[PDB]
Write a protein that binds this DNA or RNA. Structure first.
Ligand SMILES: [Mg+2]
Ligand SMILES: [Mg+2]
Ligand SMILES: [Mg+2]
Ligand SMILES: [Mg+2]
Ligand SMILES: [Mg+2]
Ligand SMILES: [Mg+2]
Ligand SMILES: [Mg+2]
Ligand SMILES: [Mg+2]
Ligand SMILES: [Mg+2]
Ligand SMILES: [Mg+2]
Ligand SMILES: [Mg+2]
Ligand SMILES: [Mg+2]
Ligand SMILES: [Mg+2]
Ligand SMILES: [Mg+2]
Ligand SMILES: [Zn+2]
Lengths: 136, 39, 64, 193, 77, 140, 103, 135
RNA sequence: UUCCGUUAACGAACGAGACCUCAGCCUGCUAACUAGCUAUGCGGAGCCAUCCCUCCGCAGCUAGCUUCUUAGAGGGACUAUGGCCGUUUAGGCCACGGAAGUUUGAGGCAAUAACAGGUCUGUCAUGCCCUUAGAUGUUCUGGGCCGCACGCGCGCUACACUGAUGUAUUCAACGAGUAUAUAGCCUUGGCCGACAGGCCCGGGUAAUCUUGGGAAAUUUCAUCGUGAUGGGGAUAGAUCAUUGCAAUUGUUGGUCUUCAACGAGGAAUGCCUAGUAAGCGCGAGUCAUCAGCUCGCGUUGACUACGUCCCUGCCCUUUGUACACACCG
């Protein structure tokens, strides 16, 4: 009995399932894996044996508080996916749509550079040194 | 920078135990060195 | 109708089939211990096994 | 019947009755030499023909669980599986689960088959009998394969799938994989009698 | 069926399994494991492995626990 | 005076049972035999004690040191250790006839509580990864 | 006046080693010395597996070559001169004699 | 004593001891570290440090002179490399060192000359006391 | 082509066998502080508490110590004994015993004759030819050998609940360790660090130190719940560190993030008969760094058969032949 039990959650433009446990429901956001979702579920102090959907919203606001300010809740430097940015220089946690946004800004940088990796990206060939006689 | 002591070749070199012979010179001289084919 | 009859391999004769996967044995009927007939069996079999026959009439021939 | 050695120290080997005289010599539950605490005996069978007619039936069934590669060699898991299967079986039939297992093995063995033999000069498939040992072999094969095929991609545990398979085959009900396969083999055999 | 997604419907904590369903489910053989009934009564587990605990706290049916998450049942005796 | 020290062997595991005239004690590596811990193969270690009876062990303490092999091989080695140690104790201290008794109870149940398996792991030969298996062959 | 003298022998051949090893022990048995030996240490097998073919054609067949090395130890209590008197007899080829003084 | 109790219930009993027996410090990274390079998630149970302590003081109580580069092998395991074969990997030395340092800062164990770590007389005492109280 | 025997053959030579290596049995022999077990002493901890009892530590002129470990000398199996079939020969099947009764298992070695098999790119092995200074010689710098619409071969990871994850728990064997510069090859121990990795005090040329090699699968208790899911981990971004003179078409190892195909696979096809297949990990070779390979090693441990000549071939005989480069005639 979850009388206000939600099955859709729309957190951060990701359409989170209300039918799953929290630490695997919040992984639906593009930029949060199982490890970061675990850290969020810990620092916001949420019972992890709780289905996302049985939640209270005031908890949810804290979830977004920790995800948008990962540096602020003492989440360490090495944990974040934007270590030592090149456009600015900050240690950030890029989230759902900015992951794609930043990614295409990087490949655009390498394209304008005439970088080797930029041209490998543009040509559609593999970029990390793998062999390609018989793979692809 | 590592050659056969017997022929100065660069391929198939046996450096185990300090032999530093190529796999063919070692076969030609195995019995003289003392390596016996038991099994 | 048919009734399943019960027989005993009394001697084992040989190995028939293209690939030798079938044995030929002589069986003996337990209710009528006078009717001894040739049958083909699939699977390992020694002297003394009890064979269940769905029908009794069919009788094999030498080196079948 | 003074035989106080019991499977897992729970299931009495006294009072197990094999009805088929045909396979009575090829199921190892009736004599005292074949009673065991556990179905994991590091036996040196397969060394001679017909040795595995002496291997305890519970061990044969357990041996047939460790199948499909990712389960090869995993005998302790199969012994635990059989343990839970047996607890469930007696938690359904309230009867000695050895008897249920033995009845299922007997009931799930085909008695006819059809194979291509050469008659008088031309090859074509005739019907043949099944030896008792290959009857037991095929019976275990069918039950285990049925249980393993039920358990795949299912929330049902392999122990419970096996228990349902064995109780259904012991009933003889034509709902377990073992019975349907037995009857289909025997129908293909009858068709070419 | 979806018996871990079904763990938090209104029904699942109103009366559903609290003797409204599992009065009978063990009793078809008087004794049927809750881990056996995961499919015969199509309802699966962990909306159901946390209620076999609740019947324990409620003093209704005894159990055994083992390796593969095997769990068992007996209605009343 | 009773003391014997008898071993039991399997694939590579070996167990050795040292015997004293004590009360009921059986300990493998210092822990009670009740706690040899693959528990599915626990009735296997208890096979001799229930084969003879706890009563036949009312006046010996067994310290069984086991080593080598793996979990199952160590269990079978311990099995052989209890069995042959009891046989040797009844040989040297109790009686020649009541050791024949226990020998017959032990060797009617299983001949490898007293005789070890000569089976070893067959070496590997080149051309495949295994004793008998070979690399998969391709023609075209 | 009595030390702890350890004499260590190594060889590729069992018999040539054991002849000398017995000879030393008996030569030190006539002097009523304390000979604590011979101690046998695990045979060391130096193994090299090599492809028979020089050119990499045909069935890949290997030959495994092995040198067995045996390690004996004899213990004595004496002065180094008496032992040097003893370890001066005719030594078979291939045997190493490497006498030292243990602590 | 400790060898007369099953080592699972004993570790449960001891890890409940250190909890309600006073306290120890706990780092400010206990909720975030994985305990092994090959692990996927941190330990599932929030009370894992104490478990890792109670399981670990039984290692020194049954052995003598175990360093940290041996505990890393003790608690290491199988690492799966995706598409490459899996191998054996060692756990993290920071938790291994920190729990021993804490056992020192309670007097259950102590560092050993000749290297390693050894159980103390008082540390032996409480382990057999708690062992006496396990079913 | 092993033997009995037959017999225009008699007497011999190789190959098979014998032989050698490893594994299997030995409370029998020789021993062993670079292996240990036992007892006794002291040390700790429990406790009917004072002793006794249990579990560890430590030291020796404890052993009428060598069972366990190591490695030497030997012993042991010969089908020896019994039954049945057989010239009642050579042999065969069955059985008690026994560690072992397929030659006990597994290897090494291995005939005549041949191939236009492969190797001139292992060899200062070699004939002939070509070149030999503006070099096809040598050495340096940079690039390629790795490039990618595609076809093929050996494989690695998987498609999940007989499971993944996270605790607890914990059992091997075979091997390896160049003065390795001034701590250096294998690296214990202590400290810093989330990891990666780093600093310091050290051992070992080794049954002595790494390393009783504290392996994994497995076992255990939880979490997942039939969902391309928490199965799977490809592709990719950022960032840290290591090796090396230099890491770019990422050497490799870490952290967070990205979450592809894949729903057990058509025709075809490979390997396999017992500690075997399969599963699991470990060592060595290569090596400054890199193992999805190869060569070994242990661990867990089956299904089926104990046949046949149907398919693919092989040996011997008889037979036909217009084949002899020999039916790809
Ligand atoms: Mg399932
Ligand atoms: Mg794997
Ligand atoms: Mg041979
Ligand atoms: Mg050449
Ligand atoms: Mg160049
Ligand atoms: Mg190949
Ligand atoms: Mg995964
Ligand atoms: Mg696990
Ligand atoms: Mg390279
Ligand atoms: Mg390597
Ligand atoms: Mg290669
Ligand atoms: Mg003609
Ligand atoms: Mg012609
Ligand atoms: Mg033609
Ligand atoms: Zn050379």
């Amino acid at each position: 009995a979850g009388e206000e039990f939600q099955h859709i959650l729309r957190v951060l433009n990701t359409n989170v399932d209300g039918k799953q446990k929290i630490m695997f429901a919040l992984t639906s956001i593009k930029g949060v894996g199982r490890r970061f979702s675990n850290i969020v579920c810990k620092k916001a102090d949420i019972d992890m044996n709780k289905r996302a959907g049985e939640l209270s919203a005031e908890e949810m606001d804290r979830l977004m508080a920790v995800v948008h300010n990962p540096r602020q809740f003492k989440v360490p430097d090495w944990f974040l996916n934007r270590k030592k940015d090149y456009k600015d220089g900050r240690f950030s946690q890029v989230v759902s749509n900015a992951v794609d946004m930043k990614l295409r800004d990087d490949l655009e940088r390498l394209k304008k550079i005439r970088n080797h990796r930029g041209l490998r990206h543009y040509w559609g060939v593999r970029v990390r040194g793998q062999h390609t006689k018989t793979t692809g | 920078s590592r050659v056969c002591r017997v022929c100065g070749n660069s391929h198939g070199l046996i450096r185990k135990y300090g032999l530093m012979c190529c796999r063919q010179c070692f076969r030609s001289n195995a019995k003289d060195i003392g390596f016996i084919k038991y099994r | 109708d048919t009734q399943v009859k019960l027989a005993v391999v009394v001697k084992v004769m040989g190995r028939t089939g293209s690939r030798g996967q079938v044995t030929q044995v002589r069986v003996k009927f337990l209710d009528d211990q006078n009717r001894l007939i040739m049958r083909n069996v699939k699977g390992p079999v020694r002297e003394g096994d009890i064979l269940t026959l769905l029908e009794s009439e069919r009788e094999a021939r030498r080196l079948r | 019947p003074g035989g106080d050695v019991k499977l897992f120290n729970r299931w009495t080997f006294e009072d197990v009755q094999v009805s088929d005289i045909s396979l009575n010599d090829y199921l190892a539950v009736t004599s005292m030499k074949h009673y065991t605490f556990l179905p994991h005996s590091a036996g040196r069978y397969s060394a001679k023909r017909f040795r595995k007619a002496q291997c305890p039936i519970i061990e044969r069934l357990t041996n047939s669980l460790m199948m499909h590669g990712r389960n090869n060699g995993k005998k302790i898991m199969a012994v635990r599986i059989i343990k839970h299967t047996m607890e469930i079986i007696h938690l359904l039939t309230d009867a000695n689960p050895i008897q249920i297992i033995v009845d299922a093995i007997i009931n799930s063995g085909p008695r006819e088959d059809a194979t291509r033999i050469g008659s008088a000069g031309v090859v074509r498939r005739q019907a043949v009998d099944i030896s008792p040992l290959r009857r037991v072999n095929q019976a275990i094969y069918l039950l285990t394969t049925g249980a393993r095929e039920s358990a795949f991609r299912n929330v049902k545990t392999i122990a419970e799938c096996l228990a349902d398979e064995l109780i259904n085959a012991a009933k003889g009900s034509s709902n377990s994989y073992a019975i349907k396969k037995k009857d289909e083999i025997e129908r293909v055999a009858k068709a070419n009698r | 069926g979806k018996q871990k997604e079904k763990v938090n419907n209104a029904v699942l904590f109103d009366q559903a399994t609290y003797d409204k369903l599992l009065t009978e489910v063990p009793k078809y053989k008087q004794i049927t494991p809750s881990v056996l009934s995961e499919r015969l009564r199509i309802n699966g587990s962990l909306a159901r492995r946390a209620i076999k605990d609740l019947m324990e706290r409620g003093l209704i049916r005894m159990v055994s626990i083992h390796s593969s998450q095997q769990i068992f049942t007996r209605a009343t005796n | 005076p009773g003391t014997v020290q008898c071993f039991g062997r399997k694939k590579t595991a070996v167990a050795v049972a040292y015997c004293k005239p004590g009360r009921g004690l059986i300990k493998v590596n210092g822990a009670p035999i009740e706690l040899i811990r693959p528990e599915m193969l626990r009735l296997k270690a208890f096979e001799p004690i229930l084969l003879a009876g706890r009563s036949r062990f009312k006046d010996i303490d067994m310290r069984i040191r086991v080593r080598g092999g793996g979990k199952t091989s160590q269990i079978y080695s311990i099995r052989q250790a209890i069995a042959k140690s009891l046989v040797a104790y009844y040989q040297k201290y109790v009686d020649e006839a009541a050791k024949k008794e226990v020998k017959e109870i032990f060797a009617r149940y299983d001949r490898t509580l007293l005789v070890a398996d000569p089976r070893r792991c067959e070496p590997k030969k080149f051309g495949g990864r295994g004793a008998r298996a070979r690399f998969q062959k391709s023609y075209r | 006046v009595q030390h702890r003298i350890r004499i260590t022998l190594s060889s590729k051949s069992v018999k040539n080693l054991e002849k000398v090893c017995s000879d030393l022990v008996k030569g030190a048995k006539e002097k009523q010395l304390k000979v604590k030996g011979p101690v046998r240490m695990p045979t060391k097998v130096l193994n090299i597996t090599t492809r028979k073919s020089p050119c990499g054609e045909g069935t890949n067949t290997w030959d495994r070559f092995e040198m067995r090395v045996h390690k004996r130890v004899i213990d004595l209590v004496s002065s180094p001169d008496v032992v040097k008197q003893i370890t001066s007899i005719t030594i078979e080829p291939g045997v190493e004699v490497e006498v030292t003084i243990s602590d | 004593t400790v060898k007369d109790v099953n080592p699972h219930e004993f570790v449960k009993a001891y890890s409940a001891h250190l909890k309600r027996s006073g306290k120890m410090e706990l780092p400010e990274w206990v909720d975030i570290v994985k305990t092994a390079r090959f692990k996927e998630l941190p330990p599932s149970d929030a009370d894992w440090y104490y478990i890792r302590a109670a399981s670990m003081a039984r290692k020194i109580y049954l052995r003598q002179g175990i360093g940290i580069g041996g505990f890393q092998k003790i608690y290491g395991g199988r690492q799966r490399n995706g598409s490459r074969p899996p191998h054996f990997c060692k756990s993290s030395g920071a938790v291994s060192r920190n729990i021993l340092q804490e056992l020192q800062k309670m007097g259950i164990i102590d560092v050993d000359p000749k290297g390693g770590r050894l159980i103390t007389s008082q540390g032996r005492r409480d382990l057999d006391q708690v062992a006496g109280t396990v079913p």
